[PDB]
Design a protein around this ligand. Structure first.
Ligand SMILES: OC[C@@]1(O)OC[C@@H](O)[C@@H](O)[C@@H]1O
Ligand SMILES: OC[C@@]1(O)OC[C@@H](O)[C@@H](O)[C@@H]1O
Ligand SMILES: OC[C@@]1(O)OC[C@@H](O)[C@@H](O)[C@@H]1O
Ligand SMILES: OC[C@@]1(O)OC[C@@H](O)[C@@H](O)[C@@H]1O
Ligand SMILES: OC[C@H]1O[C@](O)(CO)[C@@H](O)[C@@H]1O
Ligand SMILES: [Mg+2]
Ligand SMILES: [Mg+2]
Ligand SMILES: [Mg+2]
Length: 477
């Protein structure tokens, strides 16, 4: 084994300049823990960290909608709330009958909502989960007003979270994005990404759930280029996915974690020995210059933190990043702070194909534990960071969901956008299963979170697979 970087989990002041590193020594534990698959099996991952195989005959969530990143109606404590006996979810959506292909859908994303009666066991609902599509959440043209008169070919509504909270009772924190692209998908000018808020009112009767409002979109945060990378630093920067929450350790504050990138000009040789994570006397340490020469400098993920500066939560400021993956992976997406047993779990999603040269791991969800929202985070599962991966052979090429390598597991891209719900239930969407593309919710699964390690419960639902899109409420609003 490579020696993993130790971590204390110790808490820091949220305002202090300390960033935990998910080091190359930590991420290399994933391949170290993996085995060459015994043919015809094509999974190298430890069984406890492997998502079960999703059936190829999965249902669509809705035949008229491509659905992907999904979040529940929630509060700032992570509870998932029912409203007047209805369960409610929000999703990124696109139109399968609009002339663009599934892989080009992201610049067309609209936030939609779905609802279903609360309190029905998953195995007694329709196989598709019984979600009723309510349509677009936001009025046409309301989100794009945050950009003003800038050159633009597309605008999208990307992920965040919904908080049940002025007849308005729902705050939608999301990512407004503007693109200025040639017909070949190349950037004419860098994309613009603004973490934004829109308030509205959920209403319901015996027949349906509907929303009013969301007419006024407030820009909250755009990257600074000091802590969070800008489009001028890197046209391929990531800045998105606000998760707004209350930390019981800091009463009176409201915090947000989100996805960013380290704020350097693209191609800067800025990785350090601390990003590699080896002892100076470790005879098997990697060489910093060799790692940067291999191209690892193009992988610069971070998880950002921001705090509200007014009572209405309409003004925010950045704090230093809480986690960085420099020279490890470019993507730490949809971060969430999950509170359990007085500990702070940071869960974030990533891709196999956005790992740096010399490091490898599956598509899925990554996890870290500490004693505060700013911690020397302990990567879960043998100091690796992997929580749950799609079945994957890390000893053969990754391929792509639009071009599966037949030397690779045809379910390596079966699910993405894993979101950890109360009780360790995990919801996600289906990307590719063999030749079939999803845009539908995946079976909900269950992880048992036990201090610094996790286990996929293979007796949950049918052999580890629960209901398609089972995203249940634990408390009534
Ligand atoms: O060495 C770091 C540390 O122990 O220093 C004292 C305090 O600032 C703590 O928050 C912090 O974790
Ligand atoms: O059971 C083996 C398999 O190849 O059978 C046909 C399809 O259902 C596939 O998804 C499945 O993996
Ligand atoms: O939605 C899944 C995904 O793999 O689709 C293609 C790209 O847009 C990626 O950023 C994205 O994570
Ligand atoms: O890559 C060097 C580094 O100093 O860049 C800023 C932060 O991401 C730190 O965690 C990181 O170690
Ligand atoms: O779907 C739009 C974008 O947001 C994410 O889903 C979550 O960060 C990314 O994977 C994708 O590029
Ligand atoms: Mg319209
Ligand atoms: Mg790779
Ligand atoms: Mg083969």
């Amino acid at each position: 084994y490579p020696i993993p970087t130790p971590h204390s989990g110790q808490a820091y002041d949220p305002f202090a300049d300390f960033t935990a590193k998910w080091t190359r020594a930590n991420a290399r534990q994933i391949k170290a823990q993996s085995h060459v698959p015994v043919s015809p099996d094509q999974n190298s991952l430890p069984l406890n960290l492997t998502m079960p195989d999703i059936p190829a005959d999965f249902p669509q969530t809705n035949p008229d909608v491509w659905v992907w990143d999904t979040w529940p109606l929630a509060d700032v404590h992570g509870n998932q709330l029912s409203f007047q006996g209805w369960e409610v979810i929000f999703s990124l959506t696109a139109d399968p009958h609009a002339g663009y292909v599934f892989d080009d859908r992201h610049v067309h994303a609209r936030i939609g909502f779905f609802y279903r009666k609360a309190g029905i066991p998953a195995n007694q609902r329709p196989i598709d989960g019984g979600w009723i599509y309510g349509g677009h959440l936001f009025p046409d043209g309301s989100s794009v007003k945050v950009f003003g008169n800038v050159p633009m070919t597309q605008n999208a509504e990307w992920s965040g979270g919904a908080r049940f909270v002025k007849n308005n009772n729902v705050s939608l924190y999301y990512t407004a994005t503007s693109f200025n692209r040639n017909a070949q998908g190349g950037n004419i000018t860098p994309p613009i990404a603004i973490i934004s808020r829109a308030d509205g009112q959920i209403q319901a009767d015996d027949k349906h759930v509907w929303f009013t409002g969301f007419d006024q979109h407030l820009p909250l945060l755009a990257p600074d280029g000091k802590y969070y990378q800008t489009g001028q630093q890197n046209e391929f920067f990531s800045f998105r996915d606000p998760y707004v929450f209350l930390d019981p350790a800091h009463p009176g504050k409201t915090f947000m974690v989100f996805e960013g990138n380290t704020a350097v000009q693209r191609g800067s040789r800025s990785c350090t020995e601390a990003d590699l994570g080896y002892s100076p006397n470790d005879p098997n340490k990697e060489d910093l210059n060799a790692v940067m020469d291999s191209g690892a400098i193009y992988q610069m993920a971070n998880v950002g933190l921001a705090v509200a500066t007014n009572d209405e939560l309409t003004q925010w400021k950045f704090l230093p990043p809480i986690l960085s993956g420099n020279c490890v992976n470019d993507q730490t997406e949809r971060p969430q702070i999950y509170l359990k047993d007085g500990k702070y779990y940071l869960f974030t999603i990533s891709h196999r194909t956005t790992y740096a040269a010399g490091v490898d791991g599956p598509d899925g969800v990554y996890g870290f534990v500490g004693d505060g929202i700013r911690s020397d985070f302990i990567p879960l599962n043998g100091l690796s960071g992997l929580t749950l991966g799609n079945p994957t052979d890390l000893y053969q090429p990754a391929g792509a969901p639009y071009a599966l390598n037949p030397n690779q597991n045809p379910r390596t891209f079966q699910s993405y956008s894993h979101y950890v719900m109360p009780g360790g239930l995990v919801e996600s969407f289906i990307d590719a299963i063999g030749p079939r593309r999803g845009g539908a919710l995946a079976p909900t699964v269950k992880i048992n979170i036990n201090g610094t390690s996790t286990i996929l419960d293979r007796t949950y639902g049918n052999a580890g697979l629960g209901g398609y899109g089972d995203i249940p409420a634990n408390l009534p609003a």
